[PDB]
Design a protein around this ligand. Structure first.
Ligand code: HEC
Length: 80
C-alpha cells in the first residue's frame, strides 16, 4: 500500500500521480493493465532492476522480500 511503498523508499523516486525520477505509479498501472501476469512481471522489475522502459535513468534493484515485491506490484496495478 502507500505505507509499504514509503517504508521501502519507493516514494523517494516515484509518486502516484506525477513523474519524479521513475514514472508515475498510475502510469505503470495503466501501461500494464492488460499485460498478462503483470504483477509477476512488475515484481521482478522491482527486485531485479529496470533500464530503458521509461527513459534513461535505471531503477536499481530493490532489496525487498518476495511477498513485499508482490504486494507492491498488486497495489500498483490498483492505481489506475
Ligand atoms: C530511484 C532511486 C528509484 C527507486 C528508489 C525506486 N524506483 Fe522504481 N523506477 C525508477 C526509475 C528511474 C524507473 C524507470 C526505469 C526504466 O526502465 O526506465 C523505475 C521503474 C519502476 C517500475 C516500472 C518497471 C517497468 O518495467 O515498467 C516500477 C514498477 C517501479 N519502478 C516500482 C518501484 C517500487 C515498488 C519501488 C520501491 C520498492 C521503487 N520502484 C523504487 C526509480 C526508482
Amino acid at each position: 500500500d502507500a505505507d509499504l511503498a514509503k517504508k521501502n523508499n519507493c516514494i523517494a523516486c516515484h509518486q502516484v500521480e506525477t513523474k519524479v525520477v521513475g514514472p508515475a505509479l498510475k502510469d505503470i498501472a495503466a501501461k500494464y493493465a492488460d499485460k498478462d501476469d503483470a504483477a509477476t512481471y512488475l515484481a521482478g522489475k522491482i527486485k531485479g532492476g529496470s533500464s530503458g522502459v521509461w527513459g534513461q535513468i535505471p531503477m536499481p534493484p530493490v532489496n525487498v522480500s518476495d511477498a513485499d515485491a508482490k504486494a507492491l506490484a498488486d497495489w500498483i496495478l490498483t492505481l489506475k
